[PDB]
Design a binder for this molecule. Structure first.
Ligand SMILES: C[C@@H]1CC[C@@]2(OC1)O[C@H]1[C@@H](O)[C@H]3[C@@H]4CC[C@H]5C[C@@H](O[C@@H]6O[C@H](CO)[C@H](O[C@@H]7O[C@H](CO)[C@@H](O)[C@H](O[C@@H]8OC[C@@H](O)[C@H](O)[C@H]8O)[C@H]7O[C@@H]7O[C@H](CO)[C@H](O)[C@H](O[C@@H]8O[C@H](CO)[C@@H](O)[C@H](O)[C@H]8O)[C@H]7O)[C@H](O)[C@H]6O)[C@H](O)C[C@]5(C)[C@H]4CC[C@]3(C)[C@H]1[C@@H]2C
Ligand SMILES: C[C@@H]1CC[C@@]2(OC1)O[C@H]1[C@@H](O)[C@H]3[C@@H]4CC[C@H]5C[C@@H](O[C@@H]6O[C@H](CO)[C@H](O[C@@H]7O[C@H](CO)[C@@H](O)[C@H](O[C@@H]8OC[C@@H](O)[C@H](O)[C@H]8O)[C@H]7O[C@@H]7O[C@H](CO)[C@H](O)[C@H](O[C@@H]8O[C@H](CO)[C@@H](O)[C@H](O)[C@H]8O)[C@H]7O)[C@H](O)[C@H]6O)[C@H](O)C[C@]5(C)[C@H]4CC[C@]3(C)[C@H]1[C@@H]2C
Ligand SMILES: *[C@@H]1O[C@H](CO)[C@@H](O[C@@H]2O[C@H](CO)[C@@H](O[C@@H]3O[C@H](CO[C@H]4O[C@H](CO)[C@@H](O)[C@H](O)[C@@H]4O)[C@@H](O)[C@H](O[C@H]4O[C@H](CO)[C@@H](O)[C@H](O)[C@@H]4O[C@H]4O[C@H](CO)[C@@H](O)[C@H](O)[C@@H]4O[C@H]4O[C@H](CO)[C@@H](O)[C@H](O)[C@@H]4O)[C@@H]3O)[C@H](O)[C@H]2NC(C)=O)[C@H](O)[C@H]1NC(C)=O
Ligand SMILES: CC(C)=CCC/C(C)=C/CC/C(C)=C/CC/C(C)=C/CC/C(C)=C/CC/C(C)=C/CC/C(C)=C/CC/C(C)=C/CC/C(C)=C/C=C/C(C)=C/CC[C@@H](C)CCOP(=O)(O)O
Ligand SMILES: CCCCCCCC/C=C\CCCCCCCC(=O)OC[C@H](COP(=O)(O)OCCN)OC(=O)CCCCCCC/C=C\CCCCCCCC
Ligand SMILES: CCCCCCCC/C=C\CCCCCCCC(=O)OC[C@H](COP(=O)(O)OCCN)OC(=O)CCCCCCC/C=C\CCCCCCCC
Ligand SMILES: CCCCCCCC/C=C\CCCCCCCC(=O)OC[C@H](COP(=O)(O)OCCN)OC(=O)CCCCCCC/C=C\CCCCCCCC
Ligand SMILES: [Mg+2]
Lengths: 108, 160, 111, 35, 40
């Protein structure tokens, strides 16, 4: 397993250095995970989940943003047949500012 | 427009001609009936159309439309459970058949992440899409696909 | 009960209890410092900075695109402060129509 | 108001016209399109 | 009780950590979108 890790780490860390705009994505996905964990830690420490709709609104806005970022990264690494690298952004923006409105309506 | 995907446009008009006059659909949409099914089958088709258009192409904008029309069907009828348990079955059958691609990931994850949080906004549905057994299938497949994508990366850099 | 009947009162249910303020304040400070850390990582550490910037008419389209992206989130934030849904819809339809054109013009011009 | 037999005839004529134009379209497309 | 008469999401003290997360994700997303079209 050591050989696989050795041959994958340098490959990924060279790919992320050849393309700069693949470092914007992942270091924005990573921290999202942290946010999720933090919220979970909170519900663990305060063992009562009184506003459960608020917890869901604060956790979905992380999960459903991580998945959209991952889809954008996949569609930028090697684009899909019909759609170009410029629809990949103007569709991610629309889906993101629809999810944001849904998650702002959920929490109130 | 949904049969225009499965085959050429010439084979879709026939389907329309069938569904315009057929007693199995006329029975519940007669001139006087004002039930939920009156509006609940149209959306049933439209969502499926977009899902095909989203799964066949892989775009995100064709899965957000499917999520929006699935929220509209959730608001309009209590038979959304059928879609919620049929789309994951399609994705799963494509997973184990060995036809996983980078299009299923984007399409399904966008559809789920938007449709579930949108369908939670109906006061009658409430928190069921995370509590009831019916919707659990969808959630399961969500987790499953998150694994498979990572597995694909391993295939990219590991001998078969 | 010809003469008189005993008094009756309704025993309510206890309301669900909130949590102490200091814990929430600590957990808000943690999220704030995390966001600031992400911003600092973007700016300086990861060397991901503003290499090329649009100028002239492409810069005006850029300003329009930013104006649209920020205006939608201002609309959503104002809707989160008890604004009517219909008003939000009208304010979004009066901003998408110019904003869609400007954003498409920018994304086709710049690439 | 329109009677009931007149409406029955109208519905049957609409269905026949639809089912004939569909076949005309399909038989034009089968030949004229590159196969 | 109608939806408009429940206590707001900021009057509660248990849910001040679930609004900071949303505001932070929104701010980070805005800055990300801005920096994406301004980088080689
Ligand atoms: C991983 C899978 C399986 C495991 C699971 O995740 C998925 O994790 C379980 C998690 O534990 C969940 C339970 C946790 C506790 C939850 C408690 C919750 O109560 C909610 O009930 C609403 C009813 O209206 C409240 O709304 C108002 O309720 C008023 C009181 O009646 C308040 O006043 C007011 O303020 C609130 O607003 C809402 O405020 C409140 O929170 C309940 O409605 C759902 C609940 C029971 C959950 C059901 C679904 C789960 C079991 C989840 C599910 C199995
Ligand atoms: C593209 C659209 C156009 C509009 C439309 O659909 C397709 O096509 C119209 C079509 O032409 C139809 C009419 C055709 C002419 C018919 C005439 C008929 O008139 C009768 O009424 C008697 C009353 O005394 C008269 O005597 C005598 O003349 C006849 O016995 C009427 O009873 C039904 C009728 C009017 C039809 C009613 C329904 C329509 C109008 C159809 C419908 C609106
Ligand atoms: C669907 O429709 C159906 C039918 O329409 C609905 O069913 C009805 O629901 C009603 C409410 O749930 C219910 O009413 C209650 O029935 C209880 C039955 O008790 C039986 O046993 C006792 C002995 O133990 C018998 O005396 C009694 O006759 C029955 O045979 C009653 O016990 C309830 O009485 C209490 O409430 C009434 C109304 O307020 C009071 O007048 C009465 O004195 C009791 O009050 C005590 O409890 C209340 C609880 O809120 C307190 O507020 C109050 O201050 C009293 O408190 C004292 O006692 C408690 C308990 O010991 C103690 O803790 C406290 O300190 C005090 O000492 C009441 O009568 C109907 O019977 C029922 N009908 C049928 C046919 O089933 C159904 O709800 C509908 N569904 C929905 C979802 O709405
Ligand atoms: C932290 C952050 C921020 C980010 C991190 C990253 C990230 C993205 C995280 C995301 C979250 C994660 C990671 C989650 C993890 C979870 C996991 C990994 C799980 C394991 C996987 C499994 C196990 C898969 C396998 C499926 C599986 C369980 C299968 C078992 C369950 C099952 C099979 C249940 C039952 C199936 C069933 C019942 C099927 C058929 C049912 C149907 C079709 C019903 C339809 C009925 C109809 C038609 C109803 C219509 C009703 C109307 C007609 C009438 C209505 O009435 P009216 O009111 O009049 O309208
Ligand atoms: C912790 C979160 C950090 C994630 C950031 C890095 C993720 C990553 O490496 O994704 C790469 C990988 C490969 O993408 P391609 O463009 O097709 O590769 C080109 C050649 N095959 O893509 C994915 O892994 C997407 C799915 C990631 C799911 C992560 C969940 C893991 C659950 C255990
Ligand atoms: C940007 C586009 C995003 C569109 C995606 C739709 C998914 C979001 C669904 C939630 C929106 C529901 C809605 O609009 O009703 C709002 C409504 C009014 O809120 P206000 O009091 O005015 O302001 C509150 C301020 N805190 O709030 C509610 O309580 C709604 C409760 C459940 C809504 C039921 C949905 C109604 C039917 C929806 C489909 C019908 C559309 C048919 C039109 C053709
Ligand atoms: C547009 C074409 C104009 C056709 C004009 C002919 C109309 C006609 O003659 O119908 C008469 C007739 C009776 O009129 P009276 O009530 O007797 O009024 C007498 C006062 N003079 O009118 C009706 O009641 C017809 C009822 C509606 C027809 C039902 C069938 C409709 C089919 C739907 C077609 C829509 C598909 C197009 C998309
Ligand atoms: Mg019914």
């Amino acid at each position: 397993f050591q050989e696989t890790f050795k041959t994958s780490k340098r490959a990924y860390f060279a790919q992320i250095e050849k393309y700069p705009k693949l470092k914007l994505i992942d270091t924005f996905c990573f921290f999202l995970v942290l946010l999720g964990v933090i919220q979970c830690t909170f519900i663990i420490l305060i063992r009562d989940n009184f506003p459960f709709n608020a917890f869901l609104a604060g956790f979905i806005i992380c999960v459903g943003q991580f998945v959209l970022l991952m889809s954008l990264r996949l569609q930028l690494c090697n684009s899909f047949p019909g759609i170009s690298k410029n629809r990949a952004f103007a569709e991610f923006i629309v889906a993101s500012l629809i999810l944001h409105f849904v998650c702002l309506h959920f929490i109130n | 427009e949904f049969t225009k995907e499965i085959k050429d446009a010439s084979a879709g008009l026939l389907a329309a001609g069938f569904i315009a006059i057929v007693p199995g659909y006329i029975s519940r949409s007669v001139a006087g009936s004002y039930d939920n099914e009156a509006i609940a089958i149209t959306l049933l088709m439209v969502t499926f159309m977009f899902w095909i258009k989203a799964q066949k192409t892989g775009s995100i904008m064709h899965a957000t439309c499917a999520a929006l029309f699935y929220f509209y069907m959730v608001s309009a009828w209590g038979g959304y459970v059928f879609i919620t348990n049929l789309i994951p079955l399609h994705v799963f059958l494509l997973i184990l058949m060995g036809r996983y691609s980078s299009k299923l990931y984007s399409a399904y994850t966008t559809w789920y992440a938007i449709g579930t949080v949108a369908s939670m906004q109906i006061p009658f549905v409430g928190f069921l899409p995370i509590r009831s057994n019916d919707h659990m299938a969808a959630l399961g497949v969500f987790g499953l696909i998150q694994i498979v994508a990572f597995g694909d990366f391993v295939k990219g850099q590991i001998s078969t | 009960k010809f003469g008189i009947k005993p008094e009756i009162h309704h025993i309510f249910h206890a309301e669900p209890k909130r949590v102490a303020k200091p814990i929430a304040v600590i957990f808000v400070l943690i999220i704030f410092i995390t966001i600031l850390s992400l911003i600092v990582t973007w700016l300086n550490s990861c060397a991901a900075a503003f290499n090329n910037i649009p100028t002239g008419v492409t810069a005006v389209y850029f300003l329009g695109f930013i104006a649209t992206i920020v205006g939608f989130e201002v609309i959503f934030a104002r809707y989160y402060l008890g604004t009517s849904i219909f008003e939000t819809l009208f304010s979004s339809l009066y901003l998408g129509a110019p904003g869609l054109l400007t954003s498409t013009k920018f994304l086709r011009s710049f690439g | 108001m329109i009677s009931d037999e007149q409406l029955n005839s109208l519905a049957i004529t609409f269905g026949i016209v639809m089912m004939t134009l569909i076949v005309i379209y399909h038989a034009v497309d089968s030949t004229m399109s590159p196969k | 009780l109608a939806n408009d008469e429940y206590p707001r999401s900021w009057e509660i003290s248990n849910s001040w950590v679930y609004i900071s997360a949303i505001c932070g994700v929104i701010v980070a997303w805005i800055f990300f979108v801005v920096s994406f079209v301004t980088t080689s």
